[PDB]
Amino acid sequence: NQSSSVEVSSESYETIFSQRIIRDLQKELVVGALFEELPMSSK
Amino acid sequence: NQSSSVEVSSESYETIFSQRIIRDLQKELVVGALFEELPMSSK
Q1: By the 8 A CB rule, do B14 and A42 touch?
Q2: Which residues in A6-36 are b (16+ Cβ under 10 Å) and which e?
Q3: Best residue of A38, A40, A43 to probe chain B, by most B CBs closer than 10 Å
Q4: CB count, 10 Å around CB of B14?
C-alpha cells in the first residue's frame, strides 16, 4: 500500500495464504481398463 | 527366475498347462446347403 501515514513491513503481511489446492485438466485414460484381465500364478 | 539363491529344475515346474482349446475365426460355409434336395434311389 505505502499510501497513508502508517505502513506495513512487507507484502506477506498483506496476503492470505490459503491451503486450497487446485488442478488443471488431465488427460483421460482409455486403454488402462478396456481389456479383460487374465490372472496368473507362474511365469 | 534364476536370480534367488535356490531355484527350480526347469520351466516345466513354473508353468500352468491349461486344458482349454481355443480356435481362431473360420471361413463360413454358404453354398453347402442353399440348393434344394433331390433324392435318388438308383445309379
Answers
A1: yes
A2: eeeeeeeeeeeeeeeeeeeeeeeeeeeeeee
A3: A43
A4: 13
CA distances from B3 to B15, B25, B41 (A): 17, 41, 74
Experimental method of this PDB entry: cryo-EM
Resolution of the PDB structure in angstroms: 2.9
Choose among A5, A19, A33, A39: nearest CA to B16: A39
Task: For A39, name the nearest residue in chain B, comparing CA atoms only.
Answer: B16
C-alpha cell at B5: 539363491
